[PDB]
Design a protein around this ligand. Structure first.
Ligand code: MET
Length: 526
């Protein structure tokens, strides 16, 4: 299937201001999207805001403003944040959008017609902060804003409350076997692997039916009405998850505004998602509820769900006196640099840790000393006297060993990007960058200028090509810096994307370097 590559971030609750968690998830989404665009594919990358529900409406009430005003303002803050972070997301969806609501109603009605929605009761615990139903085994004792003895979620630590309401119920229990079939037939559909195992374990134990409506009073009437029953509202999570289906169906203009909802998702060739990027905290909603809904509706399932960890700063919980502002740190250290760090410092299996110390260490060691150094050396007037890509002479075995690494890199990085495992992709590229540096050091091209100009041609060419290829594969990570690098190397635009240009030798000898003006990454004081 030649289709539009469709990658999503979660849609974020607007109870609070954008923070590192949201920036991180959307970064991952952005990177995946960028890699598929550099690969030459059609791409649609989606992010946005989750605007209905009890949680949001209570947040509005606390700020003493209407839910409508509150959500529009906070959505505005999210949009500004993502603009500032220099992402390349194709559309920003809001669940208050009228087209989204129409899709929610269609999906609901499809589920109901299928016989998978019935009128029942939920009597049990509920975390308003996670909009999550919990069993008694997932709660325990704790404290609230006052410090009174309450119940809290084992998962999140947020206060839970007992709910007893007549609710539309979705027959989730009936989907156990089909979900297990899906997990097992598609053993790469959840990443990383240990999270896939967690999901399978949970579904094996059995599934209860799921409340998909709430009484309108409970949600302060801030939600989508149930079709044919105005006394009930659609569960915020059914509403929310449906964003991916809505997004897959919106025609978007040049300015990024939604102009049309298509009837059939196939018309835009996006659904279902190739990658849903999420935090570990919402895995059950995406790997269990979502596919069950899609199975009921007869809709295709997503290819991959990738679930990441949470950040800490200085080994401590990120208000409490430990702020981590990504815009602030990007202004201090550089946007590409901070992005690189977030993506390199930890894998999707880990809870990453930020500190200025280790940020500087990676900036200086990897970006400046390994990458930047190499870029300056091969473009330097001292070494590259003609300011061009030279024509190589005959290759030694040592030359061939480096060339082989450069040739193998795209295939290796490609597999990692598709997992997806961006950390391993970065590490693979930097392994090759370190080898190129070692080669340059062994060959001492600065001496060759006077001693053996023929040999220098060969060394310089291989080095330039290694820098081009590594930089191409790093361009989704360092989108702005990659352009600077290509400009220094004089790589024509046509050669900055497309799988054809993953091949060693794509830029011909005689190509002129860009003019000199200057540092790529400036090292910071320890
Ligand atoms: C369908 S993605 C919804 C994510 C949810 N709003 C959250 O912030 O946790």
């Amino acid at each position: 299937v030649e289709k539009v590559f469709f990658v999503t971030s979660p849609i974020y609750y607007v109870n609070a201001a954008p923070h590192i968690g949201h920036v991180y998830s959307t970064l991952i989404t952005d990177v995946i999207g960028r890699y598929h665009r550099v690969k030459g594919e059609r791409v649609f990358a989606l992010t946005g805001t989750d605007e209905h529900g009890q949680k949001v409406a209570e947040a509005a009430k606390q700020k003493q403003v209407s839910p409508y005003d509150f959500t529009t303002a906070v959505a505005g803050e999210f949009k500004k944040c993502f603009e500032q972070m220099d992402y390349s997301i194709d559309y920003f969806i809001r669940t208050t959008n009228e087209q989204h609501k129409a899709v929610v109603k269609e999906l609901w009605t499809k589920l109901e017609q299928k016989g998978d929605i019935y009128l029942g009761r939920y009597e049990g615990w509920y975390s308003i902060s996670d909009e999550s139903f919990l069993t008694p085994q997932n709660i325990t004792d704790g404290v609230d804003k006052d410090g009174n003895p309450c119940k809290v979620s084992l998962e999140s630590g947020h206060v839970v409350t007992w709910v007893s309401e007549e609710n539309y119920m979705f027959r989730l229990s009936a989907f156990r076997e089909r979900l297990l079939e899906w997990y097992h037939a598609n053993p790469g559909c959840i990443v990383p692997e240990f999270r896939r195992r967690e999901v399978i374990r949970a579904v094996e134990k059995g599934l209860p039916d799921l409340s998909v409506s709430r009484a309108r009073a409970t949600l302060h009437n801030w939600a989508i009405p149930v079709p044919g029953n105005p006394d009930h509202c659609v569960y915020v999570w059914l509403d929310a998850l449906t964003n991916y289906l809505t997004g897959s169906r919106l025609r978007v203009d040049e300015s990024g505004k939604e102009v049309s909802l298509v009837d059939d998702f196939n018309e835009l060739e996006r659904f279902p998602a190739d990658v849903h990027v999420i935090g570990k905290d919402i895995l059950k909603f995406h790997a269990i509820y979502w596919p069950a809904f899609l199975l009921s509706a007869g809709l295709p399932l997503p290819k991959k769900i990738v679930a990441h960890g949470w950040w800490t700063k200085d080994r401590k919980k990120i208000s409490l006196g430990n702020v981590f502002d990504p815009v602030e740190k990007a202004e201090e250290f550089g946007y590409d640099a901070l992005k690189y760090f977030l993506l390199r410092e930890s894998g999707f299996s880990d809870d990453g840790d930020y500190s200025d110390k280790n940020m500087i260490a990676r900036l200086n060691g990897e970006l400046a000393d390994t990458l930047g150094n190499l870029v300056m050396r091969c473009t330097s007037a001292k070494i590259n006297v003609n300011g061009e890509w030279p024509s190589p002479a005959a290759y030694t075995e040592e030359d061939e060993s480096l060339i082989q690494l450069i040739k193998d890199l795209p295939g290796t990085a490609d597999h990692y990007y598709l997992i997806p495992d961006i950390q391993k992709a970065i590490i693979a590229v930097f392994d090759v960058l370190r080898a190129i540096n070692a080669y340059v050091t062994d060959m001492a091209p600065w001496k060759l200028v006077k001693t053996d100009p023929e040999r220098l041609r060969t060394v310089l060419y291989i080095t330039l090509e290694g820098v081009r290829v590594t930089t191409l594969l790093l361009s989704p990570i360092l989108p702005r810096k990659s352009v600077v690098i290509f400009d220094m190397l004089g790589v024509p635009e046509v050669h900055r994307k497309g799988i054809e240009n993953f091949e060693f030798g794509a830029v011909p000898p005689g190509t002129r370097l860009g003019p000199a003006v200057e540092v790529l990454f400036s090292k910071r004081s320890t």
